[PDB]
Amino acid sequence: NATFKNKEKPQEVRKANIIAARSVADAIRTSLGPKGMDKMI
Amino acid sequence: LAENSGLDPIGTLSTLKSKQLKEKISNIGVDCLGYGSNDMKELFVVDPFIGKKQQILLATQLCRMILKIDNVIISGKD
Amino acid sequence: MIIDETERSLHDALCVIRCLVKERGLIAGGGAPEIEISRRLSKEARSM
Numbered sequence: 001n002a003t004f005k006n007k008e009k010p011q012e013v014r015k016a017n018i019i020a021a022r023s024v025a026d027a028i029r030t031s032l033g034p035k036g037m038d039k040m041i
Numbered sequence: 042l043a044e045n046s047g048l049d050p051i052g053t054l055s056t057l058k059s060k061q062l063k064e065k066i067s068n069i070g071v072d073c074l075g076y077g078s079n080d081m082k083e084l085f086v087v088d089p090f091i092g093k094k095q096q097i098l099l100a101t102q103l104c105r106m107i108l109k110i111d112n113v114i115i116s117g118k119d
Numbered sequence: 120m121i122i123d124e125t126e127r128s129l130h131d132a133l134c135v136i137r138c139l140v141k142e143r144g145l146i147a148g149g150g151a152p153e154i155e156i157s158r159r160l161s162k163e164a165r166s167m
Contacts, residue, residue, distance in 0.1 A: 001044050055167075063166060 042071035 030037045043053035053071060060069045060079070068082040076084050139145070146152050 001047070001050075059166075 042073055046071055046073045048072075 027039075031039060043050040048071065057069050057071070057079075061067060067080055069079050070081045070086065072079060078084075
């Protein structure tokens with residue numbers, strides 16, 4: 001099918017926000033549970 | 042098929058599945074050609090059973106063939 | 120160390136008791152409610 005051309009792409013903002021949030025979530029995920037891995041900051 | 046026919050694929054697939062699951066078991070497909078309603082059983086859009094079986098078998102075999110190959114080696118050119 | 124650990128443990132216990140007070144009752148841990156809810160929602164969504 002076809003969609004709007006969208007010369008300006010607000011969806012890029014949403015993509016960037018989702019990428020950043022998912023990266024943070026993945027970083028925090030590995031610490032879940034008593035066996036979670038320690039993080040160094 | 043819904044996407045190619047100009048229909049909303051997300052809505053079309055869900056409607057077909059709901060009609061074939063909750064209401065009753067029938068033959069409801071994508072109205073690719075000009076039709077007054079769904080339920081191809083009344084539209085008499087019929088295809089051979091063995092043809093569909095062969096298509097499914099070929100697709101499964103091709104998927105297995107591509108999946109069961111792990112390394113590709115291509116020789117150089119002189 | 121004794122007093123620090125006691126303070127932390129009592130804080131955790133107070134948080135648990137507060138969770139009980141706001142909504143009485145406990146649920147099984149280990150992700151069991153997540154799996155059960157996922158299965159039930161997957162079964163129900165077929166009617167949508």
